[PDB]
Amino acid sequence: KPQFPGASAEFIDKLEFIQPNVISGIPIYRVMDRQGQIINPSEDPHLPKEKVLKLYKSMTLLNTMDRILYESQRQGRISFYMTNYGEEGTHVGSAAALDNTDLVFGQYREAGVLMYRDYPLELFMAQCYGNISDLGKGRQMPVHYGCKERHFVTISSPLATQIPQAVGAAYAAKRANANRVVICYFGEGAASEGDAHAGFNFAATLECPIIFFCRNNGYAISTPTSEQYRGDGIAARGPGYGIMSIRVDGNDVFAVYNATKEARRRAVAENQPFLIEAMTYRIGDHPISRLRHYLLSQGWWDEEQEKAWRKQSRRKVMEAFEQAERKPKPNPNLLFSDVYQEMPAQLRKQQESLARHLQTYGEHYPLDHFDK
Amino acid sequence: KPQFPGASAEFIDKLEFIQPNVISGIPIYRVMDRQGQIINPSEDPHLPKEKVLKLYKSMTLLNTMDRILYESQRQGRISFYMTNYGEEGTHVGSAAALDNTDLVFGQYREAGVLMYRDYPLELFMAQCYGNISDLGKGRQMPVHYGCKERHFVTISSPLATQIPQAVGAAYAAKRANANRVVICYFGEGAASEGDAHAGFNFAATLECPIIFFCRNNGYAISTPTSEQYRGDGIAARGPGYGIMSIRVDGNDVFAVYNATKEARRRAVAENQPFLIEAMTYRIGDHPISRLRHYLLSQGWWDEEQEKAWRKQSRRKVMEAFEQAERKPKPNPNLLFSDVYQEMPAQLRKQQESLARHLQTYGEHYPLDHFDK
Amino acid sequence: AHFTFQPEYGQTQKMNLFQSVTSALDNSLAKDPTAVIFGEDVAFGGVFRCTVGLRDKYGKDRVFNTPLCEQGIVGFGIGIAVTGATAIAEIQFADYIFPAFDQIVNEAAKYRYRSGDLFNCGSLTIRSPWGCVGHGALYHSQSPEAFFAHCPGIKVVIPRSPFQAKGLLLSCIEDKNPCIFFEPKILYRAAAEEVPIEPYNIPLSQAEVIQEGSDVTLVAWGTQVHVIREVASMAKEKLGVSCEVIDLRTIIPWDVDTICKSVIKTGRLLISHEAPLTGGFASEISSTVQEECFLNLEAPISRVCGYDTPFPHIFEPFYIPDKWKCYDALRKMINY
Amino acid sequence: AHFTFQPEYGQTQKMNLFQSVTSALDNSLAKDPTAVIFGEDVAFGGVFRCTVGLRDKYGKDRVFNTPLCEQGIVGFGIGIAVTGATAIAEIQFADYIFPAFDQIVNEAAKYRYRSGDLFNCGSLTIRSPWGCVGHGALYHSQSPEAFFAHCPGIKVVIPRSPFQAKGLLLSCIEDKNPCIFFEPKILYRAAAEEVPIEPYNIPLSQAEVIQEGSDVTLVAWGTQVHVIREVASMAKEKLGVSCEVIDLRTIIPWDVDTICKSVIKTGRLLISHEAPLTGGFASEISSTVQEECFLNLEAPISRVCGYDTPFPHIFEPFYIPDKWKCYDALRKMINY
């Protein structure tokens, strides 16, 4: 019997290398088939009609917003845009499974979480336009959303940085004795970063109530997964860290919901991390269609409702979009605040330097576009 | 049947989280028991007497050197020292399984690899004393060995940095069409660094002929493994990267040899990485004792040979040690060379500045201790 | 746009800056069979098109994608270089070089020194898009050269044009020291110039005086050279001031002699860079010139730089050290 | 040894610098129930003893070991701080802070700005052993403050004594901005001084004039303050020169006014630091003082720094900017 503190194991008296099982991977959990029918009644969440309709309307409203802002970007009216196509179900389904005060970290594909939490169209647009209504003060590139009121930590461009951060917020929640979970979204590409190894490992050793939600759509920009990793996706990494793990069909809002709800329940009770890997398709057999088929089978929707919602959502998005374009940008003074909490005197000197310069050379600057 | 590019898997219609198996870990491969008897004849490497004696003498000579240099450090004659106690078998056993020209990366516990490759006592000591004989020119802290002739890449203090480097050297070897492998040693603590995730993953996706050799002795300074990770040691991480993995008894030079020899054979033929996790004990049922027992059972050693070797090895080490202490340190001019290949003119100006300063203030500097 | 781009080695052709990088990389691979190119999304031609056609031409083992892991890209590169093979790593934006900061500063830069020259990674070059782009905000705009300037053992090199880019990149790739080559991304598709088809070199650690002048020395690098060239024109027309315009080119080791020789002549210096003032590389130049040229200085050395803030999205037009900010500082220095 | 250490808030006791750090950490945990301390090997008291007794006193959930992963330690800390809890991270040697460089510069420093103050990590402090130690060579000696000085949004703070250490560390821990506190490790066990038992604060961004003088201003930080104090004594005795000795204390944001006010009076400045000259923080001070005090300068500002090399093992006595190197530069400046 082995007496080594690093591992609990028997001896073996023959030489045998352990092989990965990649061809027969961790199976993909699914609740409803492509026609929206529940496959196994015992897995039906029986979510109420109003909630399931909110899932559907959140997804389609996001998709409407995407269409308009994508075109805005192609025209150069905003400088950058990342769509949510194919990811509407992973985000609305997971968000519905959270408590409203569970803290969310993510990056570029998480706008649907905000949509589900009723973030105003006006504020999605304010950030993308960097206008006076943006609580981010116009400082970040478009789609770098955040909302303190809705517990959605501001997105940053460097990939995977939010992973160990999310773990720290989770540790703090544990200590605060919160009945709170943290969820942290990232893509399969981002999981290659050092910071993902840091986060996964810290979460297990420090016993944190965190859900890791990895979106695996087969690509990171032009890079296919064959060039990203050679194990069985990201889900298979979880066990090597001591992390309970599961893989789900990301086109199935119910599969995502069920996995997230159970992960949330156990994470908060046991102070242990959970990893969910949602398989989706690279688009920018759709989560919106599948759920639509379910709605029809229950008698919860029809073509007149679809047409009318399609029209009402376009109007809501176009009102927000028009208002956002017509607002001024913030005061250029806001370029200097929040670097530190307070403004250092030497930084104030730079601000004063800019004000003097604009007094003399202001005709050469777009002053009419900015507030005050 | 699932159609996702990120993973090959079936659907599953019930919610099931995958659990790590940590209590029943990957078993520990062993060839000889604590009395030095071969357990399973089919696993005997039948290494020739001369080779097995070189394994034994390399280990004990290292241990003799350790005793003397450890005491030197306690007295402040050298500034720093890391011993090899408990690691003599992992290093001499693995080294014996390599081709002499296989490139080695490591850090602090790898002196036995150099010892097996016949690195002179004089040069171990020159580095620790930073004397004129040191090919490192006295620039690094003691035990930061390297040897171009013996394909042992110079050690650096930052943990885990050599892991992705080793992978790059392996990729280059593949391209050169070399029949060469790279081996990369690191501890279980160092495996927590981001750079280990980088190395493991790159080695698998880029199909590199590299052996990862992780020494798991249960501790990283004061930190037990319970605070380092929560999966089943390091070996269990391998499969999640698509890396063939095995765990071995680090007190058994034959288990280590057999695993390394087979890993080398397959790595070089298949251009794929292998991970070996050797379980040892934190000492600074010993690899030296166990092998000694094997030698006695073959009639290959006895108490008179042991006493005499014990005496001859002490003499060899004490001759080297005395010579090393009595040599001068290198010319202080060597503080400026090799920063770049060439010496930039502004750096030469600094060198000239020091020479002028020593002309005037030289009495306040230990000039008599340094060459020229 | 805040800048305007302007203007012996055999046959040339019109190339923008990304095409000139591709031409350098192509020449390098043609003549050095050890050389390989790697990083994120380089295989299909790169997100800025700098590697288009190279994988089809030289093979998938020589032009290839890594996992999404900058620390790994740099450590991997170092390892290739340790064997003597030419390793040309790409970091997708300079903003994302920081995960590799430990591999660059603690490893690559110190590799030769700390081994007594038993080992080296001299055949490593790391190339990366750099500098502002009008709308890149905090993480598509950064100019990190001052962070690297404090690390002996690496070279940091930044071109101003397609012709300069190819010649400087070839010299970095062949130099026997780990080099970081920062490619001003706003120039990648902005005006072509004639670039030799065949390989040539421009020397490292050498500034270029692109316009002689007698009243003031202006120093910058990258896109900012074009800003100061315009400033020189504005000073001539509006003030009758003759400006000596210098492209530093190599950040470290830098060409101290060319800059001091200019300031001994003019007696005035203005240094400009997009990077924040505090700790920016203009402070090293200013201090040094003060030390060497103290008796020649007719006026305090001026630094016209980015403010000490992160790089803003909507406020970029107010952030950058543009031609009016440079002109105004130069006016005041001339009036001192 | 290359230096010699020397010399209202209630009851004091004799404390060396590591004990003063422990006293700061203890006061902090006593009065702030959110506060936690973490990093590599902190639980048993730390490799330099700075956390001895704290885990037994405050509990295993408040004083605890992380995995061996600096990028994780810093990212973890940021996350704690995002919730409003005080997070006091340890990086074992400053030489090993670079794996965290991206978390520090791209994340911690920019957290408040980029969110419009919706989120922040102001309750984060990263403490780390710093500076030379006689034999630490490349990776137990480094002084990284200039790398961080180029990053708006972090504060970098370095004390010279046990009394200064506790007061400065308490101010970093309570400051509403992410702070890096560098503890000069050569001082940890070198001479005690009286330190208040109860909490007190020393202000950030304020230099201290520890000796008034009229002929020259000398500026340093950390251990180097003790070197320049000795230089001042040597200049008085051997040259009849009166030196104003200043401890900068905060690297950024730095106390520009106190330094310029001193140089307007003396008309001469010498800045000294262990870190390499090129890109070192002395270049920012020199440039700035030149800009503000041009008419007052009687002689070029002198920088006496580490050479532009990695930090050597056996050659340390020849590397450091010792009292003779400082004295000689000061002699030449006085004779200018």
Ligand SMILES: Cc1ncc(C[n+]2csc(CCOP(=O)(O)OP(=O)(O)O)c2C)c(N)n1
């Ligand atoms: C540290 C860093 N490196 C590179 C990038 C550039 N980049 C932006 S998105 C992306 C691909 C992300 O892939 P994945 O994580 O799979 O998310 P997906 O876009 O597939 O949803 C890259 C490389 C970045 N933002 N950060």
Ligand SMILES: Cc1ncc(C[n+]2csc(CCOP(=O)(O)OP(=O)(O)O)c2C)c(N)n1
């Ligand atoms: C990046 C970095 N962080 C911290 C250290 C300090 N350190 C030197 S050895 C050590 C523990 C290493 O543990 P392990 O890798 O298990 O090797 P072992 O000493 O057990 O053989 C640490 C934390 C270092 N050298 N590098």
Ligand SMILES: [Cl-]
């Ligand atoms: Cl449209």
Ligand SMILES: [Cl-]
């Ligand atoms: Cl991006």
Ligand SMILES: [Cl-]
């Ligand atoms: Cl204009």
Ligand SMILES: [Cl-]
């Ligand atoms: Cl002894």
Ligand SMILES: [Cl-]
């Ligand atoms: Cl160490």
Ligand SMILES: [Cl-]
């Ligand atoms: Cl003396």
Ligand SMILES: [K+]
């Ligand atoms: K991020």
Ligand SMILES: [K+]
């Ligand atoms: K190392």
Ligand SMILES: [K+]
């Ligand atoms: K090079």
Ligand SMILES: [K+]
């Ligand atoms: K703080």
Ligand SMILES: [Mn+2]
């Ligand atoms: Mn992806």
Ligand SMILES: [Mn+2]
């Ligand atoms: Mn260990």
